């Protein structure tokens, strides 16, 4: 169809969900290019565009990636005792590996803005995917050392997120909650 699932911007922002169950239906090359181009058009620190995307479609490689995305029992990061998106990395027809080059973005106040820049691009990627009737999910749980070795990624590049990309197998699950605007927004100075 290419255009049937098109949405108004605010509607796409509202209805976008993390998708973790994918059909094996292939992703049209046109849609993949559009999703990646959306990432390309993100703003970045001084327009340095420090993001780099490795796009994997090979089945054997995707299984190997999925096997590097388990949580180490009891040594998991905050909030993931397991990785609900682990199977998605094998099952989705495409996996986009989003990387950043740290010295190619702001490094001040002990903050490394390549992480911010990749976040911005990732959100363009995920909104564009959703706009085109695809699903995706940001995967932050992965063994970076082993994944870098598997993929042969240049040493200077830091891996930030993995993105399964494909057609959702099922309809929109009523996702997790959000905090009320009153909890996350404060008006004026604070005393």
Ligand X SMILES: Cc1cc2nc3c(=O)[nH]c(=O)nc-3n(C[C@H](O)[C@H](O)[C@H](O)COP(=O)(O)O)c2cc1C
Q: Which residues are annotated as a binding site for FMN?
A: 16-18, 20, 83, 85, 140-141, 178
Give the count of alpha carbons within 13 A of 100, CB side only.
25
Q: Are 90 and 22 in contact (CB under 8 A)?
A: no
Binding partner at 85 among a second copy, ligand X, none, C-beta below 5 to 8 Å by kind: ligand X
Q: Output the smallest distance, CB 112 to a second copy, in A.
A: 7
13 makes contact with ligand X (CB under 6 A): no
Binding marks (x or -) toward ligand X, 44..73, rule CB under 6 A? xxxx--------------------------
Binding marks (x or -) toward ligand X, 94..123, rule CB under 6 A? -------------------x--xx--x---
17 makes contact with ligand X (CB under 6 A): yes
CA 143 to chain centre: 16
Taking CB under 8 A as the criterion, the residue among 26, 63, 82, 103 binding a second copy is 103
Query: Which residues, 33 to 62, sit near a second copy by CB under 8 A?
Result: 33-34, 36-43, 45-49, 51-58, 61
Helix or strand (DSSP H, E) at 136? strand 135-136
Query: Which residues, 121 to 150, sit near ligand X by CB under 6 A?
Result: 137-141
Nearer to ligand X, 129 or 157 (CB): 129
C-alpha closest to that of 94 among 42, 56, 63:
56
- Contacts of residue 3, defined as CB under 8 A and 6 or more positions apart, other chains included, come to none
Burial 126-140 (b: 16+ CB within 10 A, else e): bbbbbbbbbbbbbbe
């Amino acid at each position: 169809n290419l255009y049937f699932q098109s949405m108004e911007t605010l509607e796409a922002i509202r209805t976008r969900r993390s998708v973790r169950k994918f059909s094996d239906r292939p992703v049209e090359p046109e849609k993949l290019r559009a999703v990646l181009d959306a990432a390309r058009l993100a703003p970045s620190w001084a327009n340095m565009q420090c993001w780099r995307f490795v796009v994997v479609e090979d089945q054997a490689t995707k299984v190997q990636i999925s096997e590097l995305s388990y949580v180490e029992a009891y040594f998991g990061p905050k909030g993931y005792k397991s990785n609900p998106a682990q199977k998605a990395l094998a099952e989705a027809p495409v996996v986009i590996i989003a990387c950043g080059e740290p010295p190619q973005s702001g490094e001040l106040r002990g903050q490394q803005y390549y992480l911010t820049d990749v976040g911005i691009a990732a959100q363009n990627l995920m909104l564009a995917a959703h706009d085109l009737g695809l699903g995706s999910v940001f995967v932050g749980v992965f063994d970076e050392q082993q994944l870098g070795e598997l993929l042969g990624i240049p040493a200077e590049l830091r891996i930030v997120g993995l993105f399964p990309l494909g057609y959702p197998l099922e309809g929109p699950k009523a996702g997790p909650s959000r905090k009320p605007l009153d909890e996350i927004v404060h008006y004026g100075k604070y005393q």
